[PDB]
Amino acid sequence: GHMLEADLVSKMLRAVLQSHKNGIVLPRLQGEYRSLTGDWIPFKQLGYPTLEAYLRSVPAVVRIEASRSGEIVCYAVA
């Protein structure tokens, strides 16, 4: 047994964020995420329009701060 796709990407996303308490900007997120999962973020594949929208859609496990600059920094929550 192993994680199902949506659970795999969620737990591994979460785990990178839990190590990286400084947060990771959305393109840096893609990088460090793919270092752990060996896959790119399934945003469009699951049907979210953007990397940000995928990260908006996990508020029970992950957290985000969209900066005034238009970047978004990603964080863990569980």
From Swiss-Prot:
Function: Component of specific cytoplasmic RNA granules involved in post-transcriptional regulation of specific genes: probably acts by binding to specific mRNAs and regulating their translation. Required for lens transparency during lens development, by regulating translation of genes such as CRYBB3 and HSPB1 in the developing lens. Also required during spermatogenesis.
Family designation: Belongs to the TDRD7 family.
Full-protein interval shown: 1 to 76 of 1086
Protein name per its UniProtKB record: Tudor domain-containing protein 7
Effect of gene knockout: Mice develop cataracts and glaucoma and males are sterile. Within 4 weeks of birth, mice develop a posterior cataract that becomes severe with age. At later stages, the lens fiber cell compartment develops vacuoles with lens capsule rupture and extrusion of fiber cell mass into the vitreous. In addition, the mass of fiber cells passes through the pupil into the anterior chamber of the eye. By 4 months of age, iris flattening is detected and anterior chamber depth increased.
Localization annotation: Cytoplasm
Top-level taxon of origin: Eukaryota
Domain HTH OST-type residues, every copy: 5-78
Organism: Mus musculus
Tissue specificity comment: Mainly expressed in testis. Expressed in spermatogonia, spermatocytes and round spermatids (at protein level). Also expressed in the developing lens.
